[PDB]
Design a protein around this motif. Structure first.
Motif, short mmCIF file in Angstrom:
data_model
loop_
_atom_site.label_atom_id
_atom_site.label_comp_id
_atom_site.label_asym_id
_atom_site.label_seq_id
_atom_site.Cartn_x
_atom_site.Cartn_y
_atom_site.Cartn_z
N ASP A 48 85.73 21.03 39.54
CA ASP A 48 86.01 21.10 38.11
C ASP A 48 87.24 21.95 37.83
O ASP A 48 87.29 22.69 36.85
CB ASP A 48 84.80 21.66 37.36
N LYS A 63 86.70 27.52 30.80
CA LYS A 63 85.81 26.75 31.66
C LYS A 63 84.77 27.66 32.30
O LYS A 63 84.82 28.88 32.15
CB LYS A 63 86.61 26.02 32.74
N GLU A 108 91.42 22.56 37.11
CA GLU A 108 92.46 21.94 36.31
C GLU A 108 93.57 21.38 37.19
O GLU A 108 93.74 21.78 38.35
CB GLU A 108 93.04 22.94 35.31
#
Length: 99
Positions: A16, A84, A18
């Motif tokens: 997960d 996040k 970027e």
């Protein structure tokens, strides 16, 4: 037993991520949380050169990786824009059953 060999044993899985997360970024996240990361490998393509969206992190040993993986396993990841969650999992997350 004999020492033998060890590759991704004392490492943790970090997905997960970027499309702009490089060895530097990842290292910053851990360091920011007060964790001394050993190494970081960003899985990117050869043609697109884009990061699949996950990277591997090395540590002193499994023991440390654990306590260091449970301390951020669910905590908010710094830097992440807008924001996040620290996505960490056992390097041996092969299959839903195993756990």
């Amino acid at each position: 037993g004999s020492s033998g060999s060890s590759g991704m044993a004392a490492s943790l899985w970090m997905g997960d991520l970027e499309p702009y997360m490089d060895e530097n970024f990842i290292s910053r996240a851990f360091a920011t949380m007060g964790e001394t990361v050993m190494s970081v490998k960003i899985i990117r393509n050869r043609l697109t050169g884009i990061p699949a969206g996950y990277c591997f992190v090395e540590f002193a040993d499994l023991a440390t990786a654990e306590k260091c993986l449970h301390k951020i396993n669910g905590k908010p990841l710094p830097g992440a824009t807008p924001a996040k969650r620290f996505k960490l999992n056992y390097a041996t997350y092969s299959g839903p059953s195993s756990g």
